[PDB]
Design a protein around this ligand. Structure first.
Ligand SMILES: Cc1cc2nc3c(=O)[nH]c(=O)nc-3n(C[C@H](O)[C@H](O)[C@H](O)COP(=O)(O)OP(=O)(O)OC[C@H]3O[C@@H](n4cnc5c(N)ncnc54)[C@H](O)[C@@H]3O)c2cc1C
Ligand SMILES: NC(=O)c1ccc[n+]([C@@H]2O[C@H](COP(=O)([O-])OP(=O)(O)OC[C@H]3O[C@@H](n4cnc5c(N)ncnc54)[C@H](OP(=O)(O)O)[C@@H]3O)[C@@H](O)[C@H]2O)c1
Length: 537
């Protein structure tokens, strides 16, 4: 029996529309499925106040760079979500991709039919579609869910989660004016950190509930003159080759020096100067051993801590905002606009919930182990888990994807897992998303998958699956690259260790950290050598 589609793509964010575009372009039949009303993914769903890029708008906008909408005009150096959402829509216009999608539609299950080499795709636990290939693009981050906190539904005031902020007919967020309300914000990752300073401008009082501080550095956002935009657009051919060559696809690359190759004075100037420069330079232009060597990371950590005490009046407030938990850059660094100067305000309080954990949410507000906080509003900036885990994906022998990866994700090329043939996992932590400029990384990985699909069609092949040897090898290499860096002991739960009954040890990182150009090259060695490592029939 023979599938109705060549490919189904789940997701209509930047990654998934580009992939769907590419397949219809190569003249094959594709069906996109999306949950939301429309294209956008991240830029469709997150509508919280202050939601902004951390990647230069000109560098994230691969669709402009690639010549699809090159005439696009960016209004700031780091676009806000509504502008981001307009960008994705215009790209969608140009690709003409929407007509290939079913919106308002959840994929509930996906099952591999080995007799027929195809995937049955279940829409809303109702309709079934068949495709030779299934491609997930379901996003590097999973879903809005309540945090694990008792009493949530009892609060008698307004309760927002950040990824589900209510909007008006215009699509703009509502209840953003907190005049004369007492507001609680839970979470200080990148989302909290964007929301807080804006919530502070109008709230009567504002309580920040923080389990662990992150390291955050200044965004340095500013408007984009028309002159600059034209200039950038003319240099798109160069910027593209440039972003294509850096390890993150950020327009930054590491300093060629070790930290100790300079004196203390010289490191200081170097740090001072980057710190004051917009964007991620402070992180991604740093010394080459910044994430490899404790002493090198301590230089910059110390420096950022100093900046934090400079910007925070109250010494005791400040030292709670400075991590000791962890090395600098060992998570994706939140970027901010006056985040620290918010806590200098009279009406703003930092609540340390490590020392005093939330005990529960109350019709009145919030209870910690040792105080109670009356609130008129609670905003849940509690972040995300993966996204595939919410679909019942079953491969050969009816094995669940979830069980296959219990001991850690296991793939070849971060793109297919053994047991799951003809299935591609685009953009996820396990193929690099965590530290990528995903506008670019995601786009390049889609074009590769398009190349493999086209090769299978051209040779009349209908079946692909990694061998066990090629999968074990890649997975051990991904782990090994990851162990050489500081993140390995930083993020204990990013590593799955299993000691199987036979008494053997398996190590897998949840997070792939190899450089992008080096990873794409290994992909191209594979593709050119007739997809050596995949079984093909
Ligand atoms: C607030 C925020 C800011 C960010 N800023 C940056 C940045 O500056 N730079 C950067 O590189 N990255 C950033 N990211 C990461 C971001 O995820 C990527 O930039 C990019 O948007 C990922 O696109 P995607 O298409 O791969 O996934 P997504 O944008 O998450 O799109 C996934 C889509 O598929 C849908 N879907 C999921 N499951 C199903 C299903 N079961 N059935 C039907 N549809 C489904 C979802 O509803 C969603 O529309 C940010 C993320 C967030 C949340
Ligand atoms: N472009 C940008 O500047 C930008 C903006 C938004 C998001 N992003 C991306 O989105 C990712 C996630 O960001 P995020 O801000 O949504 O989440 P996050 O960084 O994963 O953290 C969510 C916050 O909530 C806390 N928390 C989680 N569960 C809790 C609970 N049950 N009770 C109390 N506190 C809890 C966490 O503290 P603990 O650390 O102790 O768990 C953390 O500070 C980031 O890694 C970033 O890459 C980027």
């Amino acid at each position: 029996k023979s599938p109705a589609l060549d490919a189904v793509v789940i997701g209509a964010g930047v990654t998934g529309i580009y992939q769907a575009f590419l397949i219809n372009q190569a003249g094959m039949k594709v069906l996109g499925i999306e949950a939301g009303e429309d294209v956008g993914g991240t830029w469709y769903w997150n509508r919280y106040p202050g939601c902004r890029l951390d990647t230069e708008s000109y560098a994230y906008g691969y669709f402009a760079l690639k010549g699809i909408i090159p005439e696009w005009e960016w209004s700031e150096n780091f676009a806000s979500q509504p502008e981001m959402l307009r960008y994705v829509n215009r790209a969608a216009d140009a690709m003409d991709v929407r007509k290939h999608y079913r919106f308002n539609t959840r994929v509930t299950a996906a099952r591999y039919v080995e007799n027929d080499r195809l995937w049955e795709v279940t829409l809303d636990n109702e309709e079934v579609v068949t495709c030779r290939f299934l491609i997930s693009a379901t996003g590097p981050l999973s879903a809005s869910r309540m945090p694990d906190i008792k009493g949530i539904d009892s609060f008698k005031g307004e309760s927002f989660h950040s990824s589900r902020w209510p909007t008006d007919a215009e699509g703009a967020p509502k209840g953003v004016d907190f005049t004369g309300k007492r507001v609680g914000v839970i979470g200080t990752g990148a989302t909290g950190v964007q929301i807080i300073p804006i919530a502070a401008e109008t709230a009567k009082e504002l309580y920040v509930f923080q389990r662990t501080p992150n390291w955050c550095t200044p965004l340095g956002n500013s408007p984009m003159s028309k002159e600059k935009m034209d200039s950038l657009r003319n240099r798109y051919p160069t910027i593209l080759e440039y972003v294509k060559s850096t390890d993150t696809a950020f327009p930054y690359h590491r300093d060629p020096r070790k930290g100790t190759d300079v004196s203390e004075s010289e490191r200081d100037a170097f740090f001072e100067e980057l710190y004051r420069q917009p964007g991620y330079g402070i992180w991604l232009s740093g010394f080459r051993d910044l994430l490899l060597n404790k002493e090198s990371n301590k230089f910059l950590a110390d420096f950022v801590a100093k900046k934090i005490r400079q910007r925070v009046k109250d010494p005791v407030v400040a030292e709670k905002l400075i991590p000791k938990d962890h090395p600098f850059g060992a998570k994706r660094v939140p970027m901010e606009t006056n985040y620290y100067e918010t806590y200098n305000r009279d009406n703003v309080h930092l609540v340390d919930i490590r020392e005093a954990p939330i005990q529960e949410v109350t019709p009145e507000g919030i209870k910690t182990a040792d105080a109670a906080y009356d609130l008129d509003v609670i905003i849940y900036a509690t972040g995300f888990d993966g996204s595939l885990d919410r679909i019942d994906i079953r491969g050969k022998d009816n094995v669940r994807l979830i069980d296959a990866w219990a001991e850690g994700p296991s793939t070849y090329l971060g793109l297919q897992a053994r047991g799951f043939p003809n299935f591609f996992t685009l953009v996820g932590p396990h193929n690099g998303s965590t530290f990528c400029n995903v506008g670019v990384c995601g786009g390049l990985q889609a074009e590769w998958v398009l190349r493999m699909i086209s090769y299978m069609k051209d040779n009349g092949f209908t079946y692909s699956e990694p061998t066990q040897a090629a999968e074990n090898r890649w997975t051990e290499e991904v782990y090994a690259d990851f162990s050489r860096t500081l993140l390995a002991e930083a993020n204990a739960w990013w590593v799955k260790t299993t000691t199987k009954p036979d008494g053997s040890v398996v190590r897998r990182t949840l997070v792939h950290v190899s450089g992008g150009p080096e990873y794409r090259k290994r992909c191209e060695q594979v593709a050119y050598n007739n997809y050596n490592g995949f079984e093909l029939a």
